[PDB]
User: What shape does this take?
Amino acid sequence: MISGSVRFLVNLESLNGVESIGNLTKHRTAPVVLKTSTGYLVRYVPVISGEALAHAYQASLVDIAKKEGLPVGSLSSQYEFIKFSTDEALKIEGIKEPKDYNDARRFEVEVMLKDVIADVGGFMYAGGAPVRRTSRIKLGYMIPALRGDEIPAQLEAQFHVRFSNKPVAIFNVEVSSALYTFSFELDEDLIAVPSTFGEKVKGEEELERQKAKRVKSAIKALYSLLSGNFGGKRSRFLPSMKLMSLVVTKTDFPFMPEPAHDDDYIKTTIMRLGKAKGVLNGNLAKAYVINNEGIEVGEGVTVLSTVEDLVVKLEEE
Amino acid sequence: MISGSVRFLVNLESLNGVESIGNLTKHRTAPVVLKTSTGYLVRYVPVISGEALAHAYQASLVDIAKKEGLPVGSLSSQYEFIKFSTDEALKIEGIKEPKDYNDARRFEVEVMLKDVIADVGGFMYAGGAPVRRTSRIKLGYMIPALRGDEIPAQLEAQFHVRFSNKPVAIFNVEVSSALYTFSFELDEDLIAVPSTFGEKVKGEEELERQKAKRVKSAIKALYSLLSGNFGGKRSRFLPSMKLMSLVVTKTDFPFMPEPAHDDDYIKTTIMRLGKAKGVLNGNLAKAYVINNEGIEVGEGVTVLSTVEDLVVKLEEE
Amino acid sequence: MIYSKVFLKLHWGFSVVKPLAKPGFYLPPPTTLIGALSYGKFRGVDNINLGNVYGSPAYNFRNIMATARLESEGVYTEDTGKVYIPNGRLVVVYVTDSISKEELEKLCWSITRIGCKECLASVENVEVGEAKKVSGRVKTRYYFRDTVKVVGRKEFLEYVTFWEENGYIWGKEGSPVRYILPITTYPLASKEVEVEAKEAYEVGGEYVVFS
DNA sequence: CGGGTTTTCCT
Assistant: This one.
């Protein structure tokens, strides 16, 4: 598997809006409790949801996949990720619905072969015989680091006007600037593998042949997220991102690193990686770290400089 | 694509304004999160919005399009970019509203053959069958460089009077001086290309004929932004501008150069460009640099002298 | 009867929506904890033939006792109910006898999320041991069933409705069981409550009450 | 050593 914790710095930003009130567009915020000597304070802090990141990742994967000739669904060629959910979706693509429970695996293989996104992204089909497939990529909310006794995040309202020669023209937009952190998980070992018990159905050999290419494409799609091509309102409110700290761990067993909420979260995850490998009888365990804010690292870790090096090293192994 | 990062130095400036209090006219300000040796801090700093830059760019595009014989819409001929949002604009221009979803492509092509501004800068129509077209040029707020521990910017208020022979006449104006930075993105591979999915509609042949001229005009329109013809209050508060550093990159794949916040942001973006071309299986990657402050550049980079040479080189390729 | 303790560090919080407007729960139900435990062995499969119907790859761990409690402060917010408690700590206690200590420890080191995909949760430390059964008056922090009597002052008690393992099969609703939570509604925290009970396992001083 | 800024406007 691949696990990662990443720390970002963003300025003059509005990527995730919410329900509009009057003539105002509001940012997405969540409540947090901060501890003080006097007591506790409740503060509202901007956040970015976990769905925009998934949409950006899926779009990048579609763009990369169509270049290498891998199959892509008809409705997913257009950036409309409904997937093969209801009968109307199946009608356009041209797949017969599953007959019964015993035939579910065949339907899963057919869907998996007719669309890469339905494989990596996962799908759910509602009906008499539902079929399930959990996503291979796990992403969490982007929340600024609650480090120390101060929250480094702000949120202001800006006033904008449209000019006209015959007045008879005003709107407001919320802008922010925070220090974001998020973590993610990916399991390249389960790519191109069906997820239902039964007997092998004709057509799995094509999946075995396409496994390597699908894994390579899925790994390549992480470059977009780690480079900052997510969110909205980029036409006039293009943000200004920057990378500060990054820890990525590759293993052969379940594991995740510490959240990037403390100033020292690499030493802890290295020690816990050592202990987990010791206890779970693992064989492979590698850690790559990119450091730009000068925090303590530890020993026994390869130090990179950019994200392209990280992607190359991830693909090689 | 064409992606750029630009650094400007402005003195005694008042280009973007906000609501007024009493006899005082205020300058737009925003909060920024900055990293110092003692941690992370929040500051309030003057900024210039991105919609002013978009307005300047679109006005220059209107001028060039009228000069070169390309069609320009009736309302947009006067510098009023309501585009085709409301029904009154449609009635003035003389275009029938779409009937159903299948008619959306017809409406988009019809609007797109009358105004180059709607084609390049996108538009939106809300109704029974909404139609969207994302802008093909992307801008952001103009922020001063967040380098070191001290922000190089200052803001103050100034006193002014109006003379009269019969007293019965005093106002204040905020004026700023700073080192601004901003970045931009322009994808010319989608100009003069319909975006709504559907069938072929008569009139696309004319778009194919005019594509080359539209791309040429869109590239030419960047001279205004790269020169400094933007902002208001230029009749009595004409600013003193001077370019310091510029990096422009031409690629065949998505890419974003580093923000112009650190003194070393030209070497880093060139190294990243090389590695990204290596990893994403690209086929074209060129970089152009304008340097006037004697900072590190690198090796094997085309070095220009002015902005006109850059515009000519962009046009020729 | 063996027991194990696990300490989890949460990333942003957890979210489980009530069955049947989408309000959420305050603390994860035992079904979620049992599923998180079972993830360590059944990773990669989403449908197993139970014998009559495909219901879940978790209908086999249904006889493992589990409880959990908070150790920090958080807020419940509807904006799809969520419980924000970033960088918090969750302490989970597993009591069972089906498998030996080695298997339970191996499965305990293999927990990745609680609830939905976004609710990732790291693991910091585990403990394994043998528990003892008592029936005297004890003080506890973990939530228990409705039928358990109470001796102290009713000031920090809330009522919730959970489901049995019968709900593990799709197209079927689990039985409703009442539960009592010793939690302060705003801000979220945990408080100690004294109970008499009949069965309570000592897992290191923090007695766990089951009936 | 005496002397230490006077008005008329403040959107």
Notes: Chains C and B do not touch (no CB pair under 8 Å). The longest helix of chain C spans residues 30-38.
